[PDB]
Amino acid sequence: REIKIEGDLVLGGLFPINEKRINEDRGIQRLEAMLFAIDEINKDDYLLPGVKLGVHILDTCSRDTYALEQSLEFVRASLLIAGVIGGSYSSVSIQVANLLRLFQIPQISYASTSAKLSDKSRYDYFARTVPPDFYQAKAMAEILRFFNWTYVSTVASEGDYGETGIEAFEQEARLRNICIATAEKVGSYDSVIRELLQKPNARVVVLFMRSDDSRELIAAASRANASFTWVASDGWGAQESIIKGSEHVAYGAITLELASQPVRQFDRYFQSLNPYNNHRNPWFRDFWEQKFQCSLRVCDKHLAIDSSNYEQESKIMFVVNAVYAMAHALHKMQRTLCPNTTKLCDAMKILDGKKLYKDYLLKINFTAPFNPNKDADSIVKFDTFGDGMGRYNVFNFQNVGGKYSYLKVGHWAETLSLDVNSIHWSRNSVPTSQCSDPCAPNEMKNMQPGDVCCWICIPCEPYEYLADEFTCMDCGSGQWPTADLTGCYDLPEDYIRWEDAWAIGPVTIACLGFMCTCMVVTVFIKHNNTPLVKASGRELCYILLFGVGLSYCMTFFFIAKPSPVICALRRLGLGSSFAICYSALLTKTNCSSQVFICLGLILVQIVMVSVWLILEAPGTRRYTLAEKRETVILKCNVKDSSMLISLTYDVILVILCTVYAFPENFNEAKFIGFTMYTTCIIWLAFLPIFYVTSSDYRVQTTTMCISVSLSGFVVLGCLFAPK
Amino acid sequence: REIKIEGDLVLGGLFPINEKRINEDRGIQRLEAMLFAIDEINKDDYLLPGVKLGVHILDTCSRDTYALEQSLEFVRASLLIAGVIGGSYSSVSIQVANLLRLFQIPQISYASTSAKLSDKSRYDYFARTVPPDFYQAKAMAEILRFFNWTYVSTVASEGDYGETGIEAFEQEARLRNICIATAEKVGSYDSVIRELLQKPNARVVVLFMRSDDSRELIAAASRANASFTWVASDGWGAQESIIKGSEHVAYGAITLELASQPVRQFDRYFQSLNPYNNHRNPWFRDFWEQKFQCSLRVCDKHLAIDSSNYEQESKIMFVVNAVYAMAHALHKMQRTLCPNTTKLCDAMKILDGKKLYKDYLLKINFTAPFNPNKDADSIVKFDTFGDGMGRYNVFNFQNVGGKYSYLKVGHWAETLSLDVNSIHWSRNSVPTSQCSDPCAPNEMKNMQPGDVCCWICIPCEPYEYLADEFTCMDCGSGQWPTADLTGCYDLPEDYIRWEDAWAIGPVTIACLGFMCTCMVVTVFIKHNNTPLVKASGRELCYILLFGVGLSYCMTFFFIAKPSPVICALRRLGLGSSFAICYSALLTKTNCSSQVFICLGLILVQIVMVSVWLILEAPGTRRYTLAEKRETVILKCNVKDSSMLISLTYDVILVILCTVYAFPENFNEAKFIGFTMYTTCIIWLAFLPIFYVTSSDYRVQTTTMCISVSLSGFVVLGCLFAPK
Ligand SMILES: N[C@](CC1c2ccccc2Oc2ccccc21)(C(=O)O)[C@H]1C[C@@H]1C(=O)O
Ligand SMILES: N[C@](CC1c2ccccc2Oc2ccccc21)(C(=O)O)[C@H]1C[C@@H]1C(=O)O
Ligand SMILES: *[C@@H]1O[C@H](CO)[C@@H](O)[C@H](O)[C@H]1NC(C)=O
Ligand SMILES: *[C@@H]1O[C@H](CO)[C@@H](O)[C@H](O)[C@H]1NC(C)=O
């Protein structure tokens, strides 16, 4: 059975008014709204005056292979058609787009929200007046980056709602760094809430599921006493038969629903339908015996459609709207292609469908009817694909005192414009659900435990530099870390001795070793004919006057600064105070006389080249040293053995003065025999005092300054009796 | 009008037997072959015995919107159908795949080669028995990489043959490095051969065009006398009405055609069709009055279908083949789904089309009929998309002597298997058409002039290293290039002097300067009480004996090797032979006497520290030098001014001996007065001899060796009279 009424040019409709029983909520509630919407068009002079509209609507029986064998009665007049209206479901309007494409006919579906239907290179005569469902992974990914929740755990639903919603959620999740944790797919029952506790720092579940497979979750997560704050897509909606099981666990969620003001005058029409004043609809004499349970038992004559039984559908403002889309596009045809006329012209029999849909239906813009406060949001655009503007609502769940009941807290069209005083989630909080907060460069060794987007960031070493965001290494041996831990610094070395409370030492030692060396110059070179310059020698003792000041200044050319040529001189300077100041004064004391000078130099230069022998490979180097990771010193190329090789090898010479001090016994054991060991105690007792030191400050000069203080009167103290 | 004959289950066909006149070549020649192919199936007991086949074929009128309004007579029995055969064109079998998909019916097209029809997620009931045209950019890109032609210039054709062939040629061109040059698109006439001469190192044109827009090219490139060797796709084919205009310019091309042996017994059938023994076909009584020009003028009773007028079509082995595809798939149905029977069982009324095409039609494999030497290439596979195996032919154009006529030189199925003795292109050549051949690393500076794939490669510098394939830089100052020009080498420096035909010089100079210094030791230190050691001094002249050998060996510690401490000694060694060997022998010659020694040292050490003064900042360095890009020397840190500062500043001392040589006139001007300038001539005359040199080999010692030869007898030659 079907219904067709003629006219100037007619429309066509499909409507699910059978079930695989009359579908009394999604069926007749919609179909009798279209026939109301026609009867305003044929009685409004500001609309199409002469184009008297009729209709030819069928019964799509909610199954695809009954639509096709029904839809051919449209196309078998090419009772002509100008465009079908309506494919209600989303599998029944994908098999009358693959057969109304092939005959150049526009198709306007009033409810069918899916995502494949906007693939306009495959369904190129299809424009609908509901938003698709790639615009619900663009609210629940913009009321997550408004509350700064960045670690969620989503659960889909199996079939064709979830797998094209969630795979459109992740691709709008990476665009705001909102990175998910766990993605289960319910087709089990208690396991999907078992896996949703193993990440307990994720307190927001994005719930993208149907309206039947989101009772068995909530009735399971009330049978385990857990709690969350859910965001959920249109499967929840405002349907108040999803919380009547467990009115406590679902408290505090926020969800979305398609916004639609009810149409006012339609309730003043549809509540005046008695089945004796409706001789037009061939289903009204079978719907009336189903929502009243009669059999026209026996029907009552006083029965009517009151306001206690006819709460109208959510989607009625998407039929009365989306038949005015056709009755304004086809108003532009008769007033442009054939002007100066009212009736259908002769150029209307070739009803160019391809020129209709692609030119001046898809680019139309007009206010909605039956709405007060016009041009607020009541304009019906179409985008560049055939999908109307998405205007949602955000429903919160404020349990005000007595009964758990829903509430509206704002909406969005392109910018989420909430009212920020309904967050009633756990007790009163903004339940952040963000893991492992960003941290300071002091703890910049951020390493993740295997799961992405939250980590541990620990302080690595104070001698280390932050190499990367997830890597740090040491700034370097001889490179000290600065605050800019990417490129840190070098390390300041240490060799300073310019008055380190010790450099005044050799100055006063020169004031006692070299200043009293002029007292040697006051007597010893002042008498070269005295009996003191006789075979009891004093012209020999100019070589003690030469070493009177060089021994008083040996560390004066060592303790300044280890510059690699300058410190090599004092490396080569230990031998001069080993032979010509000590051993030359330890060779002439065997007591010829006329040739008594040359016998000394025959034994003096036996070690003058041996200092160059140890200077063969090592020498003229001032390499640096560092032990405790922040303490660095600048020293010389000298081992402890080689430092002993200058110390304990030249201290063997005291064995060459033990018996050698004691046929020339005369007045020489009293004074020059006295200093054979009492000057050597500065070398005997000071052997292990270098073995202990490592800073080497006072021992840097006490191997010289006490010994040269002995040298101020080794023989000149006994030569102080005359003059 | 149409034709339907009943049966157990029937097939359906579309055939272009009208033109937008009966299409007597592509029409009735094909349609009457299908009805022949049926009448062997209903009379072959090894085939389907009880399934008596009938047919119901229509007239697709070569236009899309006449196929659809014709094709609904198939689908209005769901006179039932089991699968349509045939969509002939390639726009008429893309509008009976978008309407036979929607009702689960397989479709087999016998000729329709295109590329969109293998998009089997959009046309999912479509299997054809011709190869598509993504398998003709896979022969003409494999008989280009067999003759090693790698630089071509292709010309497409506008519409839907070229733009889906050439855009499938480039994507099979980059896979073998065969890179194209110019891609014009003919929709002008003479300009497309104007642009095909501006790259005259491209002698092969890939010609991917139709059969009408490839006469206007050849009839233009004969009106400009040019020449090429063409490869061309199936637009040429073997059609001998494309060369009859210009039988000389097109000589030597090679082209492709779909291989099809003619069907033998069909010519023994179709040549027995009189229009009184054919009471079945409702077009045969209008085709007969068109290929005989009669009007059944007046027809002749003796007229018949002879062998002089019925040269059969190329594509008849693709209909008699591709109706046996259905009559072997549907043989497997009746012998599996309902075995132990011959007739159609009760489970045949639900003819499961989706279970038919996707399971055991697309995976079928069977020999072709009416062909001798079976199983050579006569098996009919289907690939994983619904496209048969591509088996072409490669036609060459050997002009044998008298007439230009085509010839077959081999074929390919998956491997191009030619016969390599037909290359008859210009005179007799393999016309390589490859630009700017690869070259040696000696010329590895390969830079392209703007056009890709051919370049110029030039030799860059012999002191340069090949950095990249298109970049070279210098190997380095102090880095010599090797043959491995990626990482070349360092450069060997030059400081060698170990017997460079000059080191024996100072050895013999020591044999005359230091060996005769022992002759000074033979007399001068052998008498310290003689009148020669008196106030006429000789104990002073030990300082001439000291400098007797050090002047004989000053370059002996300079000309060895410039090691940076060792050469610094000879840098510090010029002063000793400037004062104590020369100026100390130029200070005592003012003639006290008892203190005559200390007056000399008061003036001797006036320049002993001035050598350290110029050694303040510069010194102990041995930096290297190089001028002519392959010649490097190792020298010392010495400028020409500083080398003069050791030379011309110490040569001022001759002005301190001019008047100073001449109250002590005695016997001293004869010998020691003689050497005041005749030793200075070794310093006077040798001032500019350093200003010229840069190799410094003989002048490295002649500033010493002649002067020390004077020093062998400066005073000892006059002290040679006694002893
Ligand atoms: N357009 C809907 C949307 C629908 C849907 C809506 C909410 C929850 C589950 C659900 O199941 C799917 C699955 C795929 C595509 C669309 C949906 C339809 O039924 O197709 C529905 C408004 C139409 C009506 O029933 O009036
Ligand atoms: N299948 C063909 C192939 C055809 C074609 C072949 C050669 C040159 C030009 C040309 O034009 C196009 C353009 C697009 C797709 C196919 C073609 C057809 O006519 O469609 C032709 C074998 C069918 C027949 O005519 O019997
Ligand atoms: C993060 O979101 C909260 C939610 O109220 C907001 O107040 C806050 O300003 C956001 N953070 C920053 C750094 O802006
Ligand atoms: C390039 O192609 C020619 C064509 O005859 C072939 O003989 C030759 O071997 C090919 N080049 C190489 C390097 O194989």
Numbering used by the authors:
A (entry chain B), B (entry chain A): 31 to 50, 59 to 116, 140 to 248, 255 to 363, 371 to 665, 686 to 756, 762 to 822
Question: What wording appears in the published article?
Answer:
Eight G protein-coupled metabotropic glutamate receptors (mGlus) are essential in sensing glutamate concentrations from the ten nanomolar to ten millimolar range in the brain. The mGlu3 is in high sequence homology with mGlu2, but mGlu3 is of greater interest because it is responsible for the detection of very low concentrations of glutamate. Each mGlu3 subunit is composed by a Venus flytrap (VFT) domain, a transmembrane domain (TMD) consisting of seven TM helices, and a cysteine-rich domain (CRD) connecting the VFT domain and the TMD. Here, we present three cryo-EM structures of human mGlu3 homodimer: the agonist-bound state (bound with LY2794193), the antagonist-bound state (bound with LY341495) and the antagonist/NAM-bound state (bound with LY341495 and VU0650786) at overall resolutions of 3.68 Å, 4.17 Å and 3.71 Å.
In the structure of antagonist/NAM-bound mGlu3, the two TMDs of mGlu3 underwent a remarkable twist and brought TM3/TM4 helices of both subunits into close proximity. Additional density inside the allosteric pocket of each mGlu3 TMD may correspond to the NAM VU0650786. The mutations W7826.50A and F6523.40A largely impaired the effect of VU0650786 through decreasing its potency (increasing its IC50) by more than 23 fold compared to the wild-type. Comparing the structure of antagonist/NAM-bound mGlu3 with that of antagonist-bound mGlu3 revealed that the inactive VFT regions of both structures showed open conformations. The extracellular tips of the TM4, TM5 and TM6 helices in antagonist/NAM-bound mGlu3 underwent outward shifting due to the binding of the NAM in the TMD. Whereas the TMDs of antagonist-bound mGlu3 were separated, with two TM5 helices in closest proximity, the TMDs of antagonist/NAM-bound mGlu3 underwent a marked conformation twisting and entered into proximity to form a symmetric dimer interface composed of the TM3 and TM4 helices of each subunit. The proximate distance between the TM3 helices in the antagonist/NAM-bound mGlu3 was 11.6 Å (taking Cα of V639 as the reference), and the nearest distance between TM4 helices was 11.4 Å (taking Cα of Q688 as the reference). The antagonist/NAM-bound mGlu3 with the TM3/4–TM3/4 interface in close proximity indicated a fully inactive state of mGlu3. Functional studies also showed that NAM further decreases cAMP inhibition compared to the antagonist alone, confirming that NAM stabilizes the fully inactivate state of mGlu3, likely acting as an inverse agonist. Upon NAM binding, the TMDs undergo a clockwise twist, which results in a closer distance between TM3/TM4 helices from the two subunits, similar as that observed in the antagonist/NAM-bound mGlu2, suggesting a new interface for fully inactive state in mGlu dimers.
